[model samples]
Target chain A: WEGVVFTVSNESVPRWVMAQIQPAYMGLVATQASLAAAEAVAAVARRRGIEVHGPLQVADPNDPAASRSQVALLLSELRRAGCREIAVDLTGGKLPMSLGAFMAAEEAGVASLYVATPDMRTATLRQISQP
Target chain B: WEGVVFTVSNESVPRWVMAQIQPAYMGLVATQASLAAAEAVAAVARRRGIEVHGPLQVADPNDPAASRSQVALLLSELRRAGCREIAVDLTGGKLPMSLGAFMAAEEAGVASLYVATMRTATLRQISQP
Candidate 1:
């Protein structure tokens, strides 16, 4: 099944909707400030019958290296859990966090998604694949 | 000379600082909300002996398509101005604006840079190219 990982921010609704649209298995990467929102989205996804993984805690949200390491581990775990295809959503979280996650996803050779508009009515997932 | 394009935000200092470090020729893609900041940075660059191009106006900051178009044209202009190597700085501006500029840069086959930290003291320019 296809898997998706999201970088959690303070807002939960847009992420929840993204999960609803592309649900199969999901993971959330969060800093201490955004852990609650990440957990909230995970709870909703679980209820919707999606296999949800960690609100994977980021040890140092501001450090791109630290964030990259955390996401790398998460991606490895997801693969072990049997996700065939995966993508990282770079729509939320701090810039450094997003940068690190993006690098990790790129290094892992998976696709990355950016939500140009997070609004449910107009939101579209912009997928960026490796060249 | 090497050229760089920036997606302007309301904050000008970071953009200005980036221009200072990589000065040669520069361009700024800005929405109306950030036009003033863009111009402010451009003016500073000009004074510092850098050949500055448009604070190129983006028609719709929220629309990625439009931003892409604006940036595509700006890249063309920068090429015509004789810049051999170019890069887009995705450090500032709205999410959609950054997305559009990024797509345009990628399509043009140029490098892209993102500043992980904007602070002058500890800020390391994370070259994502």
Candidate 2:
């Protein structure tokens, strides 16, 4: 099964991501402030028949190390649940959150994706290769 | 010579990066809105005797493709100017700018660096290898 973890800032971006990738399992990396939005995203996913996990908390949003560990654990859990492939989306959350998440995805050797909405109307999904 | 290209949101992060990396050449990528801050960063680098280039304009701050192309050009210029090693710092700028800058760095096959300031006071410089 394919699993995807994404940081949550608002409902729209995650919603857009789910439509694009349509993973079997979805994980959310969210700060305390954004938990509500994460929950909403999870609800939307669950309705679509995708197994959802976390609104995974990032205790210190500014600490990339902590975010990295949290995301690493999420990725590990997804693997344990028999997910054969995983991708992390760096389209949402704060800068540190994105950085840490990217690091975890890199260490785990999973694909990284970014959604760039240049005009705030047209979104481009770009798959970033591992360096 | 070592070169580093970074998107400028403010002066502080770039300042911290210069202190950490001490690159021989520095390049600044900035949108029109952030040009002043980029200039301040360039000024600081120049005073420290580091060769600096740009406040290179990103015509469209939100356009990742444009930012990507601009950064790619900067990396190429740095290489042409005899920079044997190049690194891109993704700690500043908007999300799209960071994404595009990262794409350029990855394509150019250069090192990428990110500085995570967890406490807002203490900074950690991480060399993403």
Candidate 3:
């Protein structure tokens, strides 16, 4: 029933959000340090209505139990804080674990936009970075 | 013995915890209003300290259900709310449900952020209304 694009309330995603999503793919591949640094500056920008931090690029070992734990935590807090809306962008990967994260997000009630059929590749996009 | 993703905390992931995923999918070429009118509403998020609205059109046939009762609730409630976060997002598509959705978040004491993958697709670029 939807097309699959981001139509807005006549507001291009705030500068912060644009900044957040601009190099979003990099953050997915970058180290924690880089993400941390971005977050620091982003926090300040978003504080003034910026969309800092486009989204998260997470990875797990495909554990259902673990996924459950993740969702439980977010929902608990949202309710506690009296939050009413959420954005839980799901995963796109070759493993069920990615699916696991999506499920967890759904349970949490956060959301994602766009609705194109996944053209998923059956392989990891990048090699695991050494810690 | 693997755990969930997101070992590190962020400015506001709250906490990280394991999860139990489940939602599901029906099939492609399904229909616009398969279940009549529920709405998708994929994942529920809260930014700038507001829940805004639950995910949208999330639980529709997009998110399959063996009992037809589960997905029904997910799609309708989120759809009728506000925000088009889950409108056409792939959260409820395909049919291969995940084992996640049962994990933790930032404030979970072990909080972290949401993960993305190759199969995941948000309605951001497509399926807009």
Candidate 4:
């Protein structure tokens, strides 16, 4: 209901770690390249006292099945935890991974953000009317 | 056959016009901000002897219905003109315009590409009946 939300954090967008998003909890996705970096961010976030909830494995961020499944699990877990605002940061990782993340966001009917850097020229996709 | 495919050419992505793609033809969507740029690109393509079509007006590129309708018209005209291998370059435009382009691509079951700086990344997905 309140502070918690799932964020599909990725290494492709390093600024995501520093992005000012106030959620009860934040979720992280780690690829082969991003594992360590994501871990560092988690620690940074934790030390800075941000609620980072996952270092979720993508089983090779290139694998669509694995990426989609893990993200699905995260969404489910978040919903179970009573978090309604599931926001996806499709701001990083492999292109396919971003695609998968976007599909996941759409399937879940949630909101997603494309975090462009410097000023973080962000674009949010939400409530697309479907036929 | 071959002739042209539509690209949602936006001011957001300027490199799209310069990007090398050997399509039979190229169709362009000119948004509110991109009308002049799109016009220039079309002229350049024409001068280069590249078969360019439509600096198609989007009315208001920010308007989803207008964007979708114009894209639909472009797609229909492309198909009716007998050009297969339809593709969408969702490379530029406003967020809504890009979204409209992608939706149009999906509806047409045509392939689409994401234009990146160093390289162009393409992706295609359409539902199976």
Candidate 5:
């Protein structure tokens, strides 16, 4: 397993990542306007019947520091949920949210992923070794 | 050196990255609307008196795949310009643009960076070995 974390948005890529990874955890960071997009992503998961856990919501998508704290909260939640390794879907967020989430994942020493379609089956996992 | 790459934008972070890194070559990916932002970044560079290299227009910012390809193009340019390593400022773009630029840096095997002020830096070295 390449770790287990997911964030879903309007993009089909999140569904692709979730389908491939079958993560133990699923999450999102949404603004009031984008909340429906988040829900739409969850619906996609349900339709596919992917048995993931948590629709974990990270607030303050615009503020990188706050969004990061939200991610840190998710990491703690994942640890409690019996997740050993953490992976993420990076292709489905706005500017600040995506960047913040990716950096947070990296700082937490987790793996972040993307799927360029033609390279569909092979998920490009970016992870750093933390001492 | 943590490598030498720079992308300036409307946000102050790019300027901050330049202020500290003082890169050998600087660049930007600007749209028609965002061209000012890119130039504004260069102005910031000039005003602060940082002798960076470029405002090397990345052509297309909306297309991640294309922006990435542009970044690949820059890798070649940077090499010819006598740059050995690369770093990026990732805090100042719109949705697809920022994501594209970051991924481009990653795939091209350069480092994508973010500074959370003084100590915390997300200096991701794309050490694809």
Candidate 6:
């Protein structure tokens, strides 16, 4: 047989439907690593029984708040949709960032995969790495 | 045979030392999911011969910038680690954001595996490319 492979990415979101109609402007949702992140996404994807590949981190840079705050909002949305089991893919970012992502997932009881920077990410950034 | 699996994520770091040591305060590192992301890591691992398996996403929403800003910090750290291939398991975030992470990897030409969503060798976009 040939090399069979399946992949997934952990990233943020652009805007939400609710945010579109409610708030004054658009909404950015990042770090959707939680089971119940957005009700809209959950509801929309629920019918299809969409398969969330990884600890997909949802981000809304356009939001007016902290990183966690933005992520928290997305989590609340997921709760509304009744979705669960997401993978957090730490690729474009760094190691410590993984920590915060994990912190949020752990708090929400979301199963996670810790990709240690030293044990994972490449090498050297004018900083120190774990050994 | 049994189930052999590997997984990874996209998370950021705490503030950086450069911040406190220099003009900044704490440096937040995140998203070392690329070739540069594996520099420092490869160094230490080479000594002990450790295997880093992940396209681990990084982030630091605590940063005073945007979401990508926070993740960029950690990506810098991973660059110092010297990692080659990382696994981006898009279980936490959404699919579009996952596209960004993969896009970054594709740009850097780093090998990646999309796991947690799969069992073995799960690089949906760049398993060969």
Which candidate tops lDDT? 2
TM-scores of the candidates are 0.68, 0.64, 0.29, 0.59, 0.50, 0.26
C-alpha DockQ of every model: 0.09, 0.11, 0.10, 0.11, 0.07, 0.04
- Scored by CA lDDT, what does every candidate get? 0.70, 0.77, 0.28, 0.56, 0.55, 0.29
DockQ measured for candidate 3 = 0.10
Better of 3 and 4 by lDDT: 4
Q: Give the CA lDDT, 0 to 100, for residue A91 in model 5.
A: 54
Note the residue pairs that clash in candidate 5.
Answer: A4-A87, B5-B87
What does candidate 4 score on TM?
Answer: 0.59
Candidate 1 yields a Cα-based lDDT of 0.70
Tens digit per residue, CA lDDT, model 1, A3-73: 87778886554354454456588878889988988888887778878788888888777665777777888
Model 5: docking quality category: incorrect
lDDT, residue B73, candidate 1: 86
Error of 4 at B5 (Å): 4.2
Alpha-carbon DockQ of candidate 6? 0.04
Candidate whose TM-score is highest = 1
Compared with the true structure, what per-residue lDDT tens digits does model 6 show for residues B1-129? 010011122222111111111211111222444324334433333354333333234453222123233334334444555533332222223333333333343344433223211122221221110
Report the C-alpha lDDT of model 6 over A19-54, residue by residue, as the tens digit: 222221112233444324333343443354343222
TM-score of chain B of each: 0.82, 0.87, 0.22, 0.73, 0.68, 0.32
- Prediction 1 TM-score vs. true: 0.68
lDDT of 3 by residue, A1-131 (tens): 11001111112222223343432211121112233443444454546453332223223443333433444454344445444344433333322333343444455554533233423222222212111
Compared with the true structure, what per-residue lDDT tens digits does model 5 show for residues B21-44?
Answer: 666566665555566767777777
What is the TM-score ranking, best to worst?
1, 2, 4, 5, 3, 6
True contacts kept of each: 0.00, 0.09, 0.21, 0.00, 0.03, 0.00
Please report how far candidate 5 places residue B49 from its true position, in Å.
6.0
For model 4, how does the per-residue alpha-carbon lDDT over A73-111 read when each residue is reduced to its tens digit? 777777776677656655456544665665676677766
For residue B78, give model 4's deviation from the true position in Å.
Answer: 1.5
Name the regions of candidate 3 deviating beyond 4 angstroms.
A1-45, A49-61, A91-97, A108-131, B1-129
